Amino acid sequence: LPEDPKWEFPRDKLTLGKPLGEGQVVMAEAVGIDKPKEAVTVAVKMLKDDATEKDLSDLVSEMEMMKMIGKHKNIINLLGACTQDGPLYVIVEYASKGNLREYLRARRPPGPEEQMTFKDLVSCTYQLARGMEYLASQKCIHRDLAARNVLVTENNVMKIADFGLARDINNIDYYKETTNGRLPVKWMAPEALFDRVYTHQSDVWSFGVLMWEIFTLGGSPYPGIPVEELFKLLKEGHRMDKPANCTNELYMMMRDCWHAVPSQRPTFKQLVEDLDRILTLT
């Protein structure tokens, strides 16, 4: 593992703290990672003690992907890395309010946190479309888009995270999936699931499932349906019903993302445009 001085952070300027969940992510303090004297609270991703070879490869990949993606307000920011002489540490921006899924479930109405307005939910969907639009413009596919892999910071700012499965598809038409993939089925586009091909329009399908998660306030997709029965249903055109408390306009958008034909689904650019209009209203 060769050294990239641009991102290399000195280990002595980094203090590890409590785990945020468990490879494993821990909270940390990084001095001058931005202001040479200023210490900053960060998140460090690293390997577990029972880590596999694939795990280390994934961690390297995740780091490299975040490099080529670049900065964006709705994407978890790579800050630096400890790659030389010691364990691999991928230092990323810290998220004060955790992942979107638990964040939504905690804000469900009684019958714990203050429940969100409809305008808040649309804003959440709009920010994630913007983040994804930027991602696709960088010719990168996420492959694992879900509420669990979105982090929340500050005043309801959405941040796309978990790029451990992200791929670079620059100069290629599509990504070739293996037979039995590591992608969660209930978020998988049919082309990846059945034809083993993945594009930006496959992320759009996932974004549709992400939308359903947001407006069910952290509900798990295809409720009551085990994945082993989901295969056949998708081949029979099965789609999720409209979540309670959700406009038809936004449900049609979900349905658009769930078109059998990838090109017939809207683009992230088009999703932003429509959501911006919907958000401007409400």
Domain 95-280: give its CATH superfamily. Transferase(Phosphotransferase) domain 1 (1.10.510.10)
What is the per-residue burial (b if ≥16 Cβ within 10 Å, else e) of 244-255? eebeeebbebbe
- 44 contacts 79 by C-beta, under 8 angstroms: no
Domain 1-94: give its CATH superfamily. Phosphorylase Kinase; domain 1 (3.30.200.20)
User: Which three-class secondary structure state does DSSP give residue 282?
Assistant: coil
How far apart, in whole angstroms, are the C-alpha atoms of residue 233 and residue 276?
33
Flag whether 103 is marked binding.
Answer: no
Instruction: List helix spans (H) across 116-218.
Output: 118-137, 190-194, 200-215
Flag whether 261 is marked binding.
Answer: no
How far apart, in whole angstroms, are the C-alpha atoms of residue 117 and residue 70?
31
Flag whether 89 is marked binding.
Answer: no
Flag whether 164 is marked binding.
Answer: no
Instruction: Please give the backbone phi and psi of residue 235, each rounded to the nearest 5 degrees, phi first.
Output: -75, -15
Q: For the chain, what is the radius of gyration of the CA atoms? A: 19
Q: Which of 58, 144, 162, 203 is catalytic?
A: 144
- Domain definitions of the chain by residue range: 1-94, 95-280
Breaks (C-N over 2.5 A) in the chain follow: 22, 34, 111
Identify the bridge partners of residue 39 per DSSP, sorted by sequence position: 31
Q: Which has the closest alpha carbon to 128: 168, 157, 155?
A: 157
Flag whether 86 is marked binding.
Answer: no
Strand 167-168 and strand 140-141: pairing?
Answer: antiparallel
How far apart, in whole angstroms, are the C-alpha atoms of residue 154 and residue 159?
10
The question of whether 144 is a catalytic residue gets the answer yes
Q: How far is CA 159 from each of CA 165, 181, 213, 275, rounded to the nearest angstrom? A: 16, 25, 16, 17
Query: DSSP letters of 11-56?
Result: GGGEEEEEEEE--EEEEEEEET----S-EEEEEEEE--TT--HHHH
